[PDB]
């Protein structure tokens, strides 16, 4: 009758963000807005780009 192929999971390692030309954690960046200001223009995009990638499949 019904399919039992429905499973819910949420496990994954946090991605790495480049701040001022150095490796950093996306979570650490949000905690420190000053880091974003230190990030170059192109580096700033990589910060925002990652966000969209994670929000590619999130419908409520």
UniProtKB/Swiss-Prot annotation:
Give the top-rank taxon of the lineage listed in the UniProt record for this protein: Eukaryota
Where's it found, cell-wise? Nucleus
**Compositional bias segments (type: Acidic residues):** 1-13
Protein family according to the UniProt entry: Belongs to the TFIIE alpha subunit family.
What role does this protein play?
A: Recruits TFIIH to the initiation complex and stimulates the RNA polymerase II C-terminal domain kinase and DNA-dependent ATPase activities of TFIIH. Both TFIIH and TFIIE are required for promoter clearance by RNA polymerase.
The record's note on quaternary structure and interaction partners says: Tetramer of two alpha and two beta chains. Interacts with TAF6/TAFII80. Interacts with ATF7IP. Interacts with SND1. Part of TBP-based Pol II pre-initiation complex (PIC), in which Pol II core assembles with general transcription factors and other specific initiation factors including GTF2E1, GTF2E2, GTF2F1, GTF2F2, TCEA1, ERCC2, ERCC3, GTF2H2, GTF2H3, GTF2H4, GTF2H5, GTF2A1, GTF2A2, GTF2B and TBP; this large multi-subunit PIC complex mediates DNA unwinding and targets Pol II core to the transcription start site where the first phosphodiester bond forms. (Microbial infection) Interacts with varicella-zoster virus IE63 protein.
What is the protein name given in its UniProt record? General transcription factor IIE subunit 1
Q: Which organism is it from?
A: Homo sapiens
Report the portion of the entire protein shown: 380 to 439 of 439
